[PDB]
Structures are given as structure tokens and as C-alpha cells.
């Protein structure tokens, strides 16, 4: 056995995976009873065999997954492969060689490619990617998944959608790259270049051909080369390891601090989310003192554990995240009784259960014994064994704030009634011993009104207009604004006229139930759900006491049996003088008031219990609810401040637009309306006994330990903070492309894009949430009920309002969110390089250049690029419209001022005037651009691109590939645009006639990493070395190891931390107390 | 070692101490099959009602019911899961045609889309004529 | 608009919507024309996750019969009653029986 936590095990030699939970060394949740040998365990959904084990049905989003490799997401591609003779081939140890490996590939061309995760063993993946292809190859297919659902072309990119398409990829790309780094093990070395440097060694039986990828510095300088004398000027004493964990786990560090091969947004954006995660652990202290406080008083636990602090388990949210993911369930009702009727049947089924009180009318059946009592037995209807009614009716006090329960009309009497009617007056003391127990605004108006139109044509009370009448049904009394001035005041009614009537005023206004409430739960560590509450309470409509089963059944104290009596009592003054019943032939009198004595002096112990014990249990069961209770003030007679609306909001306070109203303010009453048997209440109230051997405490020491074994709270928090964080990103990223007042940094301007419609602005917040459900492993909802309906909004908010008009208004703040910072960073850093994700900056133009001088066109020389400010510049607007000219004029377009120009010079075009045109201009132009002398700048802003390395010692022309992309050319949208670079060399070629069209503005070609490696120097085509500024760390000696430059350069060799931590699951020694 | 994924994605002198013993002789009064199977079924999860949102390509997921209709219809629907739930043919708690007038209240359904229009024609189709007036083609 | 044919009644309806590729005496009029009056462009959402109660669109039309057909709802549109009213007469005629 384990001495630790008393628990029994199969096999000895089984305590070394049962002590790892504690944290000694050598599933979900572990319960274990301190009176009985029956542990339950909780295992994850999703597993099959689940053999002598709980569910753990509530989603759980997968926050802790490690990635055992180097964290980087930009990887070196060769792209014109090249060989050259070298003097050093290999290296010689006595009798053996060694093949030289080169950190970088040895081609004529080599450019940095977008590659998330290209080289990570991973546990469990996020399934998003952002796989930039080589930029040989196109690449437009990335430009085009989101809101394409329609184009008049198949490879080709709407350039309207790019804002959104880039912010997309920008999420995945933030979104893939969520993964804490593993500790492994390491592998000293003694190369005579990486002397004694521990090294790092990745998982897998390929752990020896990573070195070279991971460490320049380990290949030495065998022979002249850009690459070697890269590594020449580079240092020596920074590789591998740099600092290690002080404490350790047996032999094996804590965590590393290590040298290696990453990038910096990616070692950024894992630190920030390692700080996040580490900011939320918890302390198994913590949560001992969580469940015993949960289990208010009834239950004591404990969580034994060793010292340690390597263990990590985020379940610290807040109060706003938790009020946030509350409003988000409230909307997902949206006025419809299918998703909430199961959360009140089972909820009801477990207060069955679980409570002590045991319903059974033989006690009314002995207690009548057998006319009214006959009547009132058949009324009653003993053989009835069927109390969901009266279960339902506790059920929906702590869900008032969305379902309202009511009285089902035909529990009134059945025409009205009069007071004539024996059936009539029993259906009236069954519906005034039932209606106290809803969760209704105005109960007492219906009560006093019953009795009201019962007594028609007996005796009168003035009205307050003459649309209305006395006899007007009690069913239709649902609204506050139907409570009559009489009912009110009770001096207007005057005691010749109504000396039934006001004393039954009378007695309502003094006895009916006062509301009360009760502390549950606990804030401090497991935050609260409570709008319009404060935290620690939670609202009863009935007064509530302390604890013992010892008091009398007969006590009228109790305001329950007060309110019985003081009813049983006005029945027996209505019966008593005969009067009100002529027709009856005989003198019931002395069998009615006998009737009524025993119902008044009935053994039934309901009012005891639901003052006494039901509050305890509706706190044990609250704060281990899904759905946490949404709960509305009570007030019983005070008009002035009764609920009647509660909306939830989307605008900010500081805006007016549309008023949108939510859908749950259309309903009468406060929320759904439900109904209930009055009869079944009247019955469950008037009958009821506990077992005669019942004692408190070991009755709810031994229910609430099946429950508590049970338990998702965890996994409900675990939830919360990822449903705000969904929220938070969502508005973030939808105000960039729509038109709202978020206060945001606006990076990602110079994209084209459109004033977002609500739509568009849906159509992008179903991407945003369906890839943060597939990359957080969720299936059930997370934010969807805010795509209903302009999803263009800026700050979650609820309320609700009084009668008198003055509203209540919760706006709960938002803590900065870590993965929309996350997402702004990386936007910052695409700013400034655009290029390596396959995005250009800027404009094209388009003209004949005949020449044979190598230069590249992403960096074209001056000469040649003109703009506005240029002299002779002609620039052309929407109206532009083409005349031909008659009789061998040359035909002449429109100008912007109105002048009409020839097909010469140099033009400046939007994009939009060629995609609106695509035919007819490209009939009339191609023949000049080819042919004559015509130069076309179309401003762009942004534009995918893909080029084409031709061979400079031969013939080029590039009007094939031109007339193809101009032809493709459609108004919904653009094929990437061509480019034609020749290929770098070391020896000298000879030049031939090469003919370009397409060229850049500024300079595009900063995703070049190096040109002809393997070669000493490079003499003809574009010039390029390996970038000294990209690994900062190593050419600049005085470079402290922590030094980045984020939003300019990221760095590829970085100081990336690794870590090796435990997840020990929920322990805890379930204890009674005598 | 590795985690299967749930959802789909892209991818697409040792002795016997003394005291120790196996022997059972407490039953539990308010038990503890009854108290687990009512927490097993009261652990579910809330239902993801889908109805009115955007799919991935635009068009609204639902019906193309009336509003009110629809929701009455879905009140109707609970009312009669109830029923089954409580083993009876008859109901005692229901959702529907109880005594309050509630001929405003709405339900979310695919007969509306997100900008106040109506779904006739799923937008798709919409943004598919729209552009297809607007084209052109090469000469004869 | 409704119907199994609807390519055709963009271009009638919206005259502003195409280019202006030439010098012709129907291309000359649509440059001429002002390009910010297109569609719907006021709009009444009184309520969230609904229909918009009603807007206002730029669309070809004829000015006689859009002002009989506002007339026509002018004449409706003092017609109205509400639930509220209705209630208040049924219960007046029935004496204050039903
Ligand atoms: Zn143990």
C-alpha cells in the first residue's frame, strides 16, 4: 500500500507510477475515501476502454504540448543548384575521413523560405500550417482560401481579399507555433573547431546530421568560400549550452539555457506563452482549500504533495474572463427551451437523488381517512407518484436570469370559478399553497386576483379603469404593469364592501416569503460567475436557517407553515358564516373547517426541509455546474424595482449606431417561460418525510463524494481562458479590416482591401474561430454565438431593467490577451519583411527594357522608375475612356484634368481601372507596349510574386510570359506576377541580348540569403553574402546573448531556453468529519 | 511518444502491515451508482445551437423557417423530449403553451442572414450572379 | 431579385455600375454620372439576429409609380393597430367577459 495518500494497490512494485502523482519518483483525477475502499478515477473522453472509470465529458483544450527539436520557422532552400572543384575535401584522423558538412546549402542561389515546424517532434500538433513554397514555384494558393468562394479564374488571388487573407496567415502562423520546448539530452564533443562545448542531441537515431544544420561555428575553414570565411569571422565560445539549472531531477538539469539554430519570433512568441501558462499554476494547497470550502463545512480534503517546482497546472483565471465566457453561454441560448431543458431535468434528477426527503401522499391518505374530504382526495390525486414539477421548481431559482417559472393555466379553476364551487375553492388553496415556490416576478398579483375573480357578484373592489373588470382572468397578470392600484393600497379597499378580499390583501402583504441568500462557493481561487451579485452569494426566494433536524413540524416560525396556516385559516372565515354558498343544501360547514384544521395541522415536513437543508445542497451543486447559475434579484412586493429585460450588447459605450437589440429581450417575462403542476407542488409541499435514522453528516459526507469525484470546474476554467482569448483576437483582427472605434496599431495599411460588410466580417470571424477550434482541439462551441449578426463589434457587455425604468449595466474589463499581442508582434515583424512570406511592397511597371546589363529587377536601377513627381507623368483616373483616331491619327486616351494623350510616354494606372478593363484594354495595348515606346505603372500597394531564373549567357524574352499573366489578368482576380532574374555566377560569362517587361519600384529582393556559396566571390549577376546582421550574436563581439532587434531583422541563431516539467493529476484524500 | 487528435484539421523482510485489508462492510445510504449516474448525466455539456451562423463559404447554416414559427416549433420539440425523459406520455413541466403571451419572442434560423437580409438564395449564388454580370470576352 | 433568372437584372438596374472602356453616348453619360449612389444605403435594424425592418436603395425606377405606391402606404400605414389597442377593444365589447 501507499503510505502517502492510504491507497491500496494491486501489486507492490505498482507505487512508482502511483508516487509520481504525489511527486515522489522511483489519468485525469484521483479521489480517494477516507471510510471506504471505493477509489474513483476520471479518464479522458476520447479514450476507448474505459473500464471501471469515470467520464470526463467537458472539452478540454490541450494548453501544455512540448516540441522536442529547434524552434524556427524560416528554413534555407536551395534554389539553382551548383558544383565547383575545392582544394580541402576531407578530414583525417590517423586511418579515417570525414565528410565536410556545410551549415548552408551550396547553391548559386539560396533564399530564406516561411516553413512553421519543418523540423520539431511534437507530441500533439496544432493542425495549422503556413508552408511557403519555393518562390520558383508558384505560391498563390495561400492568397486565396479565405472568401474566394467564387473567382472567374482558378490560380488567382482576389486583390481586394488580401488584408484578410494576410491576417489569417499571420494567425495560423502565431497559432502553430504554440509549444513549450523540451529538455533533452545533450552530447559532449571534441572537434579542434567546437572544443568541449556540450552540445545538444534531438530524439531520433538521426541525432548527428542535425549538428551541421544547428551550429555553423562546428564546420571549420577548410578552403576559401563566402561560407567558410563567413564562419571565419564569426566567434568561437558561443555554441551549445550556456547556463544550466541549479537544482536538479536525479543526474539530469531542470532547465537549459542553449545556443542553437531558431529565429526570434518564435523563441519570442514561445516565451511570452511559457509566461502566460506559468502565470496561471496553481498550488495543490490551494485546491484543498477550494473543495473544502466548496463543501461548506460538510467535507474536509487534502492534497498531500512533496516540495517541488518543476510542476506546472494552469487553473488561475479571472472574474472577467469568467463573466465574459458566462455572457458568451447566456447568448447561446438565443429564446429556445431545447438547451436548457436537459440542464433542469438532470439538474433536477441530481437534486432527487441527492436530497434526504422522501415525497409520499399516504400521509394525506391517513390523515383524511375516508364530502369535502373525499373531493379534496380526488383532487389531490394520491396515486400519482410524479414530483418533476416540484423538483424543477428548486431547479429554476438558480437559473431565474434566462427561465421563468410560471403556473400552467389549468391548475387556475377552469372558468373563472366562483366561490359557489367546492372544486373550485380546493383548485384555490392548492394554487395558494403552490405559487409561493416560483421563480416568478409577480406571484401575490395572480394569488390575490384569484380569489378576486372568484368573488364576483359577493362583493366588490374599485378599479382603476373601466377597460378592465374585476373578473378578468389571473393568467393574464404576468406583466408588472398590470398590479392593481387597489392591491397596492390596500386603504382603497373597503372593509364593508371587501372583508374577505382585505384581509386576504392584508395577509398577503404581511406573510408572503421574504427573500434571502447564501454563501457559496469560493472567489479567492476559483473566481465567480455572478453578474448583478456579488461574488460570494447566491439569491434564494425563501429565508433560509441553520442546520438541525430537531425542531417541530408544527412550527410557525416557519414562514412556509405560517403562510399554510394563515391560508387554511382564511378558507376556514370564507366557510364559516355560510354566506358566498347558497345552494348548498346542507351544513358543510363542519366538514369543510374539519378539512381544513387537519390540512393545517398536517405531519408534512417539506417546509422544514426547504428552509433547512435545500439551500446547502443548491450550494454544493452550484459552483460544480457547466453551466454556472445566471440569477436576477427578488424582491417580493416592491413594485418600483421589478426586473421585466435582459439584453446583452456588442457596441461600446462611447459609439451610436444601429440598435441591435438581443434576441433575449423579446419574451414578456424576464427569460423562457416554463410550466409547472400546481397540484404536483401542493402535493410534494403537504406530504414529505426523512428516514428515520438520518443524520446529516454522514449523509452528505458520503453524497458529496461521488460528486466531487466527478468534478470538471478544472476543466471548465482551463476553458474560460481560452474563450476570452478567442474574443479578445476576434475583435482585435476584425477591427483591422473593418470600420470601428477599438483603438488598434493599424500596421497592415498598405494592403489593399475594402470597407468590410457585416457579411464579409462573418464570413472572416468563422475562419478566425474554426481554425482556433482546430488548432486548440475543440469541438463544441467557442464564440459562435456571436456570428449571428453583425459580428463588427468592440466589447462584450450584459444588463438588465427595473420597471421604474433605471437600468443596471456590467461591463467587465479585459486583461491583454495573449495571442492577439502575440499576433500584433508578428504583423509588426511582417511589416518590415514582407519578402520572406512571398508578399512585395509596392508597384509594378511595365515596359520593354532591351539591354544586356545584369541587374535584378526587384532592385532596378534609377534610371528607369518614375512616379508622380516625374516630369511628363501622366496619371489616369476612374473615367478614362479610349477614342480612336480617324484617317491615321493615333488614338488617344483620357486623361484625369480631361486632356486627351496618345498612346506614348510614361503612364501611371490603379489596379482597378485594368481589372474593370481586362479586354478592352489589353486589345489595344498590347501592340504599343511590345512594339513602341509605352511605360505602364500600375500601383499595386501588395502583390504575390513568383519568378523565374533564366540562363544569362543565352537569348531571353520574357513577352510569353508577360501576355500570359496579362491575359489572366480578370477583374475578380490577379495571377501572380512574373519575374525574370538571372542566375549569379563566379566565372565570367559572356553576355547576351536579354529582353525584360516586368520590374519592381523599391527594393523587393531582401529575402536573398547568398549567391554562389561554394565560390570564393561572386563577379557576374547580383551580388549577395551571408547577412552578418541576421546572426547578431556571433559577429558582433559586443552583443550581450539577449540581444534581439525584433521589429526590424529577426535573428536566426538565438538564446532559446528549454524546459522539462511534470503535470501530476488531481490528488486529494476525501475526509469526513464527525 | 505521441497524442491522437481528437478533431480533424489541415491534415485532411517485506511484510503485510498490519491493519490492511480488502474486506467491504459500509454500503452507502445515498449510494453511489444513483449519485454517480445522475453527476455522469448532469456533467454534459451545453448544445452548440449552430442556427443563424455563417459556414465557412458564406451561406447560412439552418432552415428557412419563419422566426417565431420555428421557435414555437422548438418549444413544441422540448415539450415532447421532456416527456420521453420523464418516462410519461403526458408532461408536467412544459415549455410550451403556457399561460404567458409570448408572440414576439425569436429563434435564430437560416431564413435570415447577417446583414438584415433574407436567405432566399444562399449567398453564394448571390456574389456568383453578381459577378457574372460583369464579364467580358476576347473578339470575334 | 427573386426568380430563375437574375444575371440580366444587375446591369438594368444599376446603370452606374459599368465601365467606361470608350467615347461612346452611353459611356459619356455613366462617367458623367456620380459614382456614390449604388445600392442599399440607409437601413433600419431594429433588432439583432432579424430582418432589417426596412431601407432605402439607389435602383432604377419610375417616379410615378413610386409615389402611388407611397401614397398607397401612407393610406395603410393610418390604418395600423396594434396588439396593445386590440386587446383593450375585445375585452370593452365583451363586457368584461372574455
Ligand atoms: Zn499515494
Redesign the interface.
Known amino acids: 500500500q501507499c503510505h502517502v495518500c492510504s491507497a491500496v494497490l494491486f501489486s507492490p512494485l505498482d507505487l512508482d507510477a502511483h508516487v509520481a502523482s504525489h511527486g515522489l519518483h522511483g489519468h485525469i483525477t484521483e479521489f480517494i475515501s477516507s471510510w471506504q475502499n471505493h477509489p474513483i478515477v476520471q479518464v479522458s473522453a476520447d479514450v476507448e476502454n474505459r473500464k471501471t472509470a469515470q467520464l470526463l465529458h467537458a472539452d478540454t483544450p490541450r494548453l501544455v504540448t512540448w516540441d522536442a527539436g529547434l524552434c524556427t520557422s524560416f528554413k534555407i532552400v536551395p534554389i539553382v543548384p551548383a558544383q565547383v572543384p575545392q582544394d580541402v575535401l576531407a578530414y583525417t584522423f590517423f586511418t579515417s575521413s570525414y565528410a565536410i558538412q556545410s551549415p548552408f546549402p551550396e547553391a548559386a542561389v539560396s533564399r530564406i523560405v516561411v516553413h512553421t515546424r519543418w523540423a520539431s517532434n511534437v507530441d500533439f500538433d496544432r493542425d495549422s500550417s503556413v508552408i511557403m513554397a519555393p518562390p520558383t514555384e508558384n505560391n498563390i494558393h495561400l492568397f486565396k482560401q479565405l472568401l474566394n468562394t467564387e473567382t472567374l479564374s482558378v490560380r488567382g488571388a482576389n486583390p481586394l481579399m488580401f488584408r484578410a487573407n494576410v491576417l489569417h496567415m499571420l494567425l495560423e502562423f502565431v497559432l502553430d507555433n504554440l509549444y513549450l520546448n523540451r529538455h533533452t539530452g545533450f552530447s559532449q564533443d571534441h572537434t579542434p573547431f567546437t572544443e568541449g562545448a556540450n552540445l545538444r542531441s534531438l530524439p531520433g537515431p538521426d541525432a548527428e546530421k542535425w549538428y551541421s544544420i544547428m551550429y555553423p561555428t562546428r564546420m571549420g575553414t577548410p578552403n576559401v568560400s563566402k561560407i567558410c570565411n563567413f564562419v571565419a569571422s564569426c566567434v568561437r565560445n558561443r555554441v551549445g549550452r550556456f547556463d544550466r539549472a541549479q537544482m536538479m531531477n536525479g543526474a539530469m538539469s531542470e532547465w537549459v539555457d542553449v545556443f542553437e539554430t531558431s529565429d526570434a519570433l518564435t523563441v519570442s512568441i514561445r516565451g511570452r506563452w511559457m509566461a502566460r501558462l506559468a502565470r496561471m499554476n496553481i498550488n495543490p494547497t490551494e485546491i484543498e482549500w477550494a473543495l473544502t470550502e466548496c463543501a461548506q463545512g460538510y467535507v474536509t480534503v487534502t492534497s498531500p504533495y512533496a516540495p517541488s517546482v518543476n510542476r506546472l497546472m494552469p487553473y488561475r483565471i479571472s472574474n472577467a474572463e469568467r463573466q465574459i465566457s458566462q455572457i458568451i453561454r447566456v447568448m447561446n441560448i438565443g429564446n429556445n427551451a431545447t438547451v436548457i431543458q436537459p440542464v433542469l431535468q438532470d439538474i433536477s434528477v441530481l437534486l432527487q437523488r441527492i436530497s434526504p426527503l422522501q415525497i409520499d401522499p399516504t400521509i394525506i391518505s391517513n390523515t383524511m381517512s375516508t364530502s369535502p374530504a373525499s373531493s379534496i382526495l380526488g383532487k389531490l390525486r394520491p396515486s400519482n407518484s410524479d414530483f418533476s414539477s416540484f423538483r424543477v421548481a428548486l431547479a429554476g431559482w438558480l437559473y431565474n436570469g434566462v427561465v421563468t417559472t410560471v403556473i400552467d393555466d389549468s391548475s387556475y379553476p377552469k372558468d373563472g370559478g366562483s366561490v359557489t364551487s367546492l372544486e373550485n375553492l380546493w383548485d384555490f388553496f392548492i394554487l395558494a399553497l403552490a405559487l409561493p415556490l416560483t421563480t416568478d416576478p409577480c406571484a401575490p398579483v395572480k394569488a390575490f386576483m384569484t380569489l378576486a375573480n372568484m368573488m364576483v357578484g359577493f362583493e366588490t373592489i374599485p378599479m382603476d379603469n373601466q377597460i378592465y373588470t374585476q373578473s378578468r382572468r389571473a393568467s393574464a397578470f404576468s406583466t408588472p404593469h398590470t398590479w392593481p392600484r387597489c392591491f397596492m393600497n390596500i386603504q382603497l379597499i373597503s372593509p364593508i364592501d371587501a372583508p374577505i378580499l382585505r384581509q386576504w390583501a392584508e395577509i398577503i402583504h404581511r406573510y408572503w416569503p421574504n427573500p434571502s441568500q447564501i454563501r457559496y462557493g469560493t472567489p479567492n481561487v476559483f473566481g465567480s460567475a455572478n453578474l448583478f451579485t456579488p461574488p460570494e452569494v447566491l439569491l434564494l426566494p425563501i429565508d433560509h436557517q441553520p442546520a438541525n433536524v430537531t425542531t417541530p413540524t408544527l412550527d410557525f416560525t416557519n414562514e412556509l407553515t405560517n403562510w399554510r396556516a394563515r391560508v387554511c385559516e382564511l378558507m376556514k372565515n370564507l366557510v364559516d358564516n355560510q354566506r358566498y354558498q347558497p345552494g348548498w343544501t346542507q351544513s358543510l360547514v363542519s366538514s369543510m373547517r374539519g378539512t381544513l384544521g387537519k390540512l393545517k395541522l398536517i405531519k408534512s415536513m417539506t417546509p422544514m426541509y426547504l428552509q433547512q437543508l435545500a439551500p446547502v445542497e443548491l450550494a454544493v451543486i452550484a459552483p460544480m455546474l457547466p453551466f454556472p447559475p445566471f440569477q436576477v434579484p427578488y424582491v417580493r412586493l416592491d413594485r418600483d424595482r421589478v426586473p421585466t429585460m435582459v439584453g446583452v450588447t456588442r457596441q461600446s459605450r462611447d459609439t451610436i449606431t444601429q440598435p441591435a437589440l438581443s434576441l433575449s429581450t423579446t419574451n414578456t417575462t424576464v427569460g423562457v417561460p416554463l410550466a409547472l403542476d400546481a397540484r404536483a407542488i401542493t402535493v410534494a409541499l403537504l406530504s414529505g418525510k426523512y428516514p428515520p435514522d438520518l443524520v446529516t453528516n454522514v449523509w452528505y459526507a458520503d453524497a458529496i463524494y461521488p460528486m466531487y469525484a466527478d468534478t470538471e470546474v478544472f476543466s471548465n476554467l482551463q476553458r474560460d481562458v481560452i474563450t476570452c482569448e478567442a474574443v479578445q483576437t476576434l475583435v482585435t483582427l476584425v477591427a483591422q479590416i473593418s470600420e470601428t472605434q477599438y483603438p488598434v496599431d493599424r500596421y497592415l495599411d498598405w494592403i489593399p482591401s475594402l470597407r468590410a460588410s457585416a457579411a464579409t466580417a462573418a464570413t472572416f470571424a468563422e475562419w478566425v474561430n474554426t481554425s482556433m477550434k482546430t488548432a486548440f482541439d475543440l469541438s463544441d462551441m467557442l464564440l459562435e454565438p456571436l456570428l449571428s449578426g453583425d459580428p463588427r463589434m468592440t466589447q462584450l457587455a450584459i444588463q438588465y431593467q427595473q420597471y421604474n425604468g433605471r437600468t443596471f449595466n456590467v461591463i467587465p474589463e479585459m486583461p491583454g490577451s495573449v495571442i492577439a499581442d502575440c499576433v500584433q508582434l508578428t504583423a509588426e515583424v511582417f511589416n518590415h519583411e514582407y519578402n520572406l512570406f512571398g508578399i512585395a511592397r509596392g508597384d509594378i511597371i511595365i515596359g520593354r527594357v532591351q539591354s544586356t546589363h545584369l541587374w535584378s529587377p526587384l532592385a532596378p536601377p534609377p534610371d528607369l522608375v518614375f512616379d508622380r513627381d516625374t516630369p511628363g507623368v501622366h496619371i489616369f483616373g476612374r473615367d478614362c475612356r479610349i477614342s480612336f483616331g480617324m484617317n491615321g491619327a493615333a488614338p488617344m486616351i483620357r486623361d484625369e484634368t480631361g486632356m486627351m494623350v496618345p498612346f506614348e510616354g510614361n503612364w501611371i494606372f490603379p489596379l482597378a481601372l485594368w481589372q474593370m478593363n481586362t479586354r478592352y484594354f489589353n486589345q489595344q495595348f498590347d501592340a504599343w507596349i511590345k512594339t513602341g515606346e509605352l511605360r505602364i505603372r500600375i500601383e499595386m500597394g501588395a502583390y504575390p510574386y513568383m519568378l523565374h531564373y533564366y540562363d544569362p549567357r543565352q537569348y531571353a524574352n520574357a513577352w510569353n510570359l508577360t501576355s500570359a499573366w496579362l491575359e489572366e489578368i480578370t477583374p475578380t482576380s490577379i495571377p501572380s506576377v512574373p519575374f525574370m532574374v538571372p542566375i549569379s555566377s563566379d566565372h565570367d560569362i559572356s553576355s547576351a541580348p536579354a529582353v525584360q517587361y516586368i520590374i519592381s519600384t523599391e527594393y523587393n529582393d531582401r529575402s536573398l540569403f547568398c549567391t554562389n556559396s561554394s565560390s570564393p566571390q561572386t563577379i557576374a549577376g547580383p551580388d549577395k553574402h551571408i547577412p552578418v546582421e541576421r546572426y547578431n550574436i556571433l559577429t558582433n563581439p559586443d552583443a550581450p546573448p539577449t540581444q534581439i532587434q525584433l521589429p526590424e531583422v529577426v535573428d536566426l541563431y538565438n538564446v532559446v531556453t528549454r524546459y522539462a516539467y511534470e503535470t501530476p493529476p488531481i490528488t486529494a484524500v476525501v475526509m469526513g468529519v464527525p | 511518444?505521441?497524442?491522437?487528435?481528437?478533431?480533424?484539421?489541415?491534415?485532411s523482510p517485506?511484510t503485510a502491515?498490519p491493519g490492511?485489508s480488502?474486506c467491504?462492510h459500509?454500503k452507502?445510504?445515498?449510494?453511489?451508482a444513483?449519485?454517480?449516474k445522475?453527476?455522469?448525466?448532469?456533467?454534459?455539456?451545453?448544445?452548440?445551437?449552430?442556427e443563424?451562423?455563417?459556414?465557412?463559404?458564406?451561406n447560412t447554416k439552418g432552415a428557412l423557417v419563419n422566426?417565431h414559427v420555428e421557435?414555437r416549433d422548438?418549444?413544441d420539440?422540448?415539450?415532447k423530449?421532456?416527456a420521453k425523459?420523464?418516462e410519461?406520455a403526458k408532461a408536467?413541466?412544459?415549455?410550451?403553451?403556457?399561460?404567458?403571451?409570448?408572440?414576439?419572442?425569436?429563434?435564430?434560423s437560416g431564413?435570415?442572414?447577417?446583414?438584415?437580409?433574407?436567405n432566399?438564395?444562399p449567398?453564394?449564388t448571390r456574389?456568383?450572379?453578381?459577378?457574372?454580370?460583369?464579364?467580358?470576352?476576347?473578339?470575334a
Do not use: C, F
Open positions: 511518444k505521441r497524442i491522437p487528435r481528437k478533431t480533424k484539421g489541415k491534415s517485506a502491515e490492511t480488502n467491504e459500509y452507502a445510504r445515498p449510494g453511489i444513483s449519485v454517480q445522475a453527476t455522469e448525466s448532469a456533467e454534459l455539456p451545453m448544445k452548440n445551437n449552430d443563424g451562423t455563417p459556414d465557412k463559404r458564406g422566426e421557435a422548438e418549444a420539440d422540448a415539450t423530449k421532456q425523459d420523464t410519461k408536467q413541466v412544459t415549455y410550451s403553451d403556457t399561460g404567458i403571451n409570448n408572440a414576439n419572442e425569436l429563434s435564430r431564413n435570415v442572414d447577417n446583414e438584415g437580409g433574407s432566399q438564395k449567398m453564394s456574389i456568383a450572379e453578381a459577378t457574372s454580370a460583369i464579364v467580358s470576352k476576347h473578339p
